[PDB]
């Protein structure tokens, strides 16, 4: 008897489901040949997580494991991965990579931290800035490891390690930040498997609607744009409720709670994304207190009021 | 009226409400002199946020605002604070400090990032490791500012700045990490106001139960223990639900879903904290799939089964 519903949350009360930051705005994109196939922030309306999606905002683009070796290359420090909750990672599980793995081409900067166990100074800790480039040939999270660029090769040990992301950037001129290009989870010349499916408009005059954040960058002018299809709190909510989808399309309305009025309406599709009736790139002009509200299950022919 | 409920979440599916990391374990503490008065992680069972508590897991111990000046002291970089959602912070509001402000004595290490606006290279960015000590005499978040220790004084500007936390540590021998000692939100020689109240057991043989995390540290042997009374996901859930509390104490039972059996029972008090019938410090031994479930509202006379 759990009916389908959205949580009541303003934009500034939403967390990006593809990077651990708040949502800044809503953005609708002109229909491209762009293949949207992001793997974080994927969840059906009846509560099925897909891709690399897990529940915790702190797990998005985070890593956990043990540093076991160093190599004489850029990506020096070999980090054998565990699942984010500490359990051993199983490279044969039906997932594209450990849950939380970044789902874009670029460099993710942040901090590595360590805490020794075992016979060598157990309990001793350290932390420092690090970088993980998802262009690296040693970025093979599906196989069980990524290699780290760090900033202080001498204060780092072969010990349990966590990576905390902070922002993203282009790596270099030939290897830019591209939020819609998936990393090679298994390394160079290997293709991805177990992916959440691609999404796109499938109705004339309709465009995708994104919850957009501008995440920190580490130099230059990159705007740090990461768009997600649904926010992390919606995912956590759908997972709790697991309400069966009564049709393939949920009609949702963005409402001003102070005035009770509807600002615009949208299609929330069964696989966990939103379309609106609009042509052109458009950052949505909405009141700060607005939020979506589930309205009804509609069918295939439903035409959205233009937005 | 609307029935009270908990979200269904294992411990590794829970976020600490006082530091942006997963819960690692449940821990019950011997009664002692501590007057638990944390300001993050505070929310009544009927959905009223208290203290410095806001909704976003990524806002916990984060700062947002603008670097506006520098001083010739350790805590060099004056960061005028905004609210985490971008709105102007009002120092006369009835809160202890901006929501999200750290609620412990110690140093918080992480990274600062900047993205210029205005006439001087707008959109140019940078990021670097930084440290904020809640002991600093310039740690006056209630008054509207904190000062940052950064690692690179020459790649830093008077521009919009955010602080992303990574871990904590003792500052020095004379200024240790004390998770139950509040910072002086208004600076040295000043006292805090608008605090969520202290929390203590009040029934013979009862002890507080904490959701415990071991957060990263940056040198030495500190275990990085941070205990929250209720996890961030419960706070978010109570805020959505706003279910009227039918008595001062909700009886809750920790259950193994795979077996259907109850592992132990606990009192969840209307102001948003848990007690259990146990004597002594004890890291709880519980299965990985276990979760609390709401049983019933009980009166003051209810005696908990020993755990």
């Amino acid at each position, epitope marked *: 008897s759990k009916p389908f519903s959205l949580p009541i949350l303003t934009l500034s009360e939403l967390t990006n489901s593809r990077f651990p930051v708040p949502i800044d705005s809503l953005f609708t994109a002109q229909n491209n040949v762009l293949q949207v196939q992001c793997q974080n922030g994927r969840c059906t309306l009846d509560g099925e997580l897909q891709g690399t999606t897990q529940l915790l905002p702190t797990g998005i683009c985070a890593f956990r494991g043990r540093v076991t070796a160093q190599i*004489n290359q*850029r990506d020096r420090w070999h980090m054998q991965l565990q699942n984010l909750n500490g359990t051993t990672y199983d490279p044969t599980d039906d997932v594209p990579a450990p849950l939380g793995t970044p789902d874009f081409k670029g*460099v993710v*900067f942040g901090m590595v931290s360590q805490r020794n166990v075992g016979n060598d100074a157990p309990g001793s800790t350290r932390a420092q*800035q690090a*970088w993980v*480039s998802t262009y690296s040939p040693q970025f093979v999270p599906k196989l069980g490891s990524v290699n780290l*660029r760090i*900033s202080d090769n001498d204060d780092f040990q072969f010990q349990p390690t966590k990576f905390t992301p902070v922002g993203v*950037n*282009d*790596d*270099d*001129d*030939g290897h830019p930040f591209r939020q819609w290009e998936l990393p090679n989870y298994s390394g160079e010349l290997t293709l991805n498997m177990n992916l959440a499916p691609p999404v796109a408009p499938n109705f004339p005059g309709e465009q995708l609607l994104f919850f957009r954040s501008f995440v920190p*960058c*580490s*130099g*230059g*002018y*990159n705007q740090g744009i990461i768009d997600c299809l649904i926010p992390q709190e919606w995912i956590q909510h759908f997972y709790q409720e697991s309400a069966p989808s009564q049709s393939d399309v949920a009609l949702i309305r963005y409402v001003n709670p102070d005035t009770g009025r509807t600002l615009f309406e949208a299609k929330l599709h069964r696989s966990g994304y939103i379309t609106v009736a609009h042509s052109g790139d458009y950052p949505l002009v909405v009141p700060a207190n607005g939020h979506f509200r589930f309205d009804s299950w509609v069918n295939q022919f439903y035409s959205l009021a233009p937005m | 009226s609307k029935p009270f409920s908990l979200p269904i979440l294992t411990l590794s599916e829970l976020t600490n409400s006082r530091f942006p990391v997963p819960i690692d374990s449940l821990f019950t503490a011997q009664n002692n002199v501590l007057q638990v008065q944390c300001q993050n992680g505070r929310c009544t069972l009927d959905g009223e946020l208290q203290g410095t508590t806001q909704l976003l897991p990524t806002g916990i111990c984060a700062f947002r605002g603008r670097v506006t000046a520098q001083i010739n002291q350790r805590d060099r970089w004056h960061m005028q604070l905004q609210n985490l959602n971008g709105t102007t912070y009002d120092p006369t509001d009835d809160v202890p400090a901006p929501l999200g402000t750290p609620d412990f004595k110690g140093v918080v290490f992480g990274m600062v990032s900047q993205r*210029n606006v205005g006439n*001087d*290279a707008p959109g*140019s*960015t*940078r*990021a*670097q490791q930084a440290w904020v000590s809640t002991y600093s005499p310039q740690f006056v978040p209630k008054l509207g500012s904190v000062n940052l220790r950064i690692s*690179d004084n*020459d*790649d830093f*500007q*008077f*521009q919009p700045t955010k602080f992303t936390p990574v871990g904590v540590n003792d500052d020095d021998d004379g200024h240790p990490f004390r998770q139950w000692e509040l910072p002086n939100y208004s600076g040295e020689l000043t006292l805090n106001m608008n605090l969520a109240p202290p929390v203590a057991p009040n029934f013979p043989g009862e002890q507080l139960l904490f959701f415990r995390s071991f957060v990263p540290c940056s040198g030495g042997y500190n275990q990085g223990i941070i205990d929250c009374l209720i996890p961030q996901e419960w706070i978010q859930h109570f805020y959505q639900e706003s279910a009227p509390s039918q008595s001062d104490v909700a009886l809750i039972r920790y259950v193994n879903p795979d077996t259907g059996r109850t592992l132990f029972e606990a009192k969840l008090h209307r102001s948003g904290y848990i007690t259990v019938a146990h004597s002594g410090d004890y890291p709880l031994v519980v299965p990985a799939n276990g979760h609390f479930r709401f049983d019933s509202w009980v009166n003051q006379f209810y005696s908990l089964a020993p755990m």
Partner: nanobody
Framework: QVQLQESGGGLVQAGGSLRLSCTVS????????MGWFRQAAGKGREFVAAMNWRYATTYHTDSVKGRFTISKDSAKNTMYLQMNSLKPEDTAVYYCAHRYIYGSLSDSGSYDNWGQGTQVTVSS
């Protein structure tokens, strides 16, 4: 530790061109990173471009990417900044910096050693 020294600055007219040079001596390795920065009067120091010293892999900010080209001499211990289509907003003291950390070439941070800089003045 690396010793750096800039040269090539001067008073040019908007539309002209300039090649700055930065000499490098001292110990350098595979992760050595060379950067160009600039600082106009009263403004923050802006990250311009950077290059991996050994492999000459580059990053240029979007603000200069069309007109400015960082590069390495084919034999000398010298890095260049080719500066075309100069504008008055390019006026600044241009600095070169070295860093033993690879990081990312897009990262403006962690630069330890700096030259004294060379003044570039563009006028209409």
């Amino acid at each position: 530790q690396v010793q750096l020294q800039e040269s090539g600055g001067g008073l040019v007219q908007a539309g002209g061109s300039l090649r700055l040079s930065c000499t490098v001596s001292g110990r350098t390795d595979s992760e050595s990173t060379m950067g160009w920065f600039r600082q106009a009067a009263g403004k923050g120091r802006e990250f311009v471009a950077a290059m991996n010293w050994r492999y000459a892999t580059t990053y240029h900010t979007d603000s200069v990417k069309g007109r400015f080209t960082i590069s390495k001499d084919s034999a000398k211990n010298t890095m260049y900044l080719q500066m075309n289509s100069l504008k008055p907003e390019d006026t600044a003291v241009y600095y070169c910096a070295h860093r033993y950390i690879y990081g990312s070439l897009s990262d403006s941070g962690s630069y330890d050693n700096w030259g004294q800089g060379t003044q570039v003045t563009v006028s209409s």
